[PDB]
């Protein structure tokens, strides 16, 4: 209960606020984290706890305090997390991010570990699943000392490995990684993506069981960004099984949510406005995995097996062994 500046272990104060004030810990520590000394180890722990929770407004202000600090380790943590947030907010390109990180450099085992994990999030975001798979082999947990950060990174990696297993069509392994992230984490973001991934593995097996997993993930979808993603997953699930879709996004310019609205229009029969959506997406820079879905939706409209051919190539280029079964199945029906 000492003043904010001379705190010794956040890992003790955090374990008493989530058990006492669990429903309001975001606003409580949004004021407490900013009063910590940016030169101490506690302030460096706060940027990781704020970012794992994706309290983006809080994270961006802790980073400013770390960058403007004058302890070399805090400056290193602040700059690495700064590049991480830039990749999240699409204000720097991945090709320019790998060049930045080269000229400094990094010497703490935590930020040397997180530098590679950060890239795995970007690889996931732009559908470069070959680089994500291979990068995870360079994450060695034996280089990290035991403590608060290591357990937090273990949670991050459990969910990265769940998506690697999903992309490789290892559904049981993906569910095991997602279940271990749930059993050993209390962060809403971790639990949300765990149940989002569980549901993704059941999209083609059973509609209800996939929806049961997304329903659990709704309980952790307080972040409106997470809400938009769960809506897109439920929109994609409703379009696959041809069920009532109450999650169609009409007010968004995101490539993936625009595709899902076009997917919805295809199932409705509004070919004119499904084509118009796919028409404008042709002027957008879609990643290799988005282009796999894009040409699959094009094939459902034009019946051209060459559209399914190019969908498959794009799915193999991004190394997606799971959703590639959508164009493959649609031509097995054609003969």
């Amino acid at each position: 209960n000492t003043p904010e500046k001379e705190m010794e272990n956040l890992g003790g104060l955090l374990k008493i606020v989530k058990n006492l004030f669990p429903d309001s810990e975001e606003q409580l520590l949004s004021e407490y984290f900013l009063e910590l000394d940016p030169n101490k180890k506690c302030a460096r722990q706060s940027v990781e706890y704020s970012d794992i929770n994706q309290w983006d407004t809080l994270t961006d202000k802790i980073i400013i305090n770390l960058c403007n600090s004058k302890n070399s380790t805090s400056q290193e943590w602040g700059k690495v997390y700064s590049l991480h947030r830039k990749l999240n907010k699409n204000e720097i390109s991945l090709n320019d991010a790998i060049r930045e990180s080269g000229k400094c450099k990094i010497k703490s085992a935590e930020m040397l570990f997180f530098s590679n994990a950060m890239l795995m999030y970007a690889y996931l975001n732009i559908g470069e699943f070959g680089l994500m798979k291979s990068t995870s082999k360079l994450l060695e947990f034996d280089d990290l000392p035991e403590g608060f950060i290591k357990e937090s990174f273990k949670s991050r990696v459990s969910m990265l490995e769940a998506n690697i297993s999903l992309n490789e069509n290892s559904l049981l392994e993906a569910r095991q990684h997602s279940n271990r992230a749930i059993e050993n984490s209390n962060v809403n973001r971790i639990c949300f993506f765990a149940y989002l991934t569980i549901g993704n593995t059941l999209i083609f097996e059973d509609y209800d069981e996939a929806k049961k997993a997304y329903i659990k993930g709704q309980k952790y979808a307080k972040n409106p960004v997470h809400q938009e993603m769960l809506d897109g997953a439920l929109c994609f699930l409703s379009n696959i099984w041809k069920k009532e879709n109450q999650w169609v996004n009409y007010n968004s310019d995101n490539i993936k949510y625009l595709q899902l609205r076009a997917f919805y229009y295809i199932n409705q029969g509004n070919i004119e406005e499904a084509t118009e959506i796919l028409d404008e997406l042709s002027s957008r820079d879609q990643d290799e995995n988005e282009l796999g879905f894009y040409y699959y939706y094009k094939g459902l409209i034009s019946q051209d097996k060459t559209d399914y051919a190019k969908s498959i190539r794009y799915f193999k280029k991004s190394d997606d062994k799971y959703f590639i079964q959508l164009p493959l199945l649609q031509l097995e029906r054609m003969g």
Binding site: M120, Y121, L124, R156, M159, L160, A162, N163, L166, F192, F193, L196, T197, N200, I203, H226, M229, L230, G232, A233, F236, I255, K256, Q259, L260, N289, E290, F293, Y294, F323
Partner: peptide
């Protein structure tokens, strides 16, 4: 497109 996340 399906929605993935970690």
């Amino acid at each position: 497109s399906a929605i993935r996340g970690a």
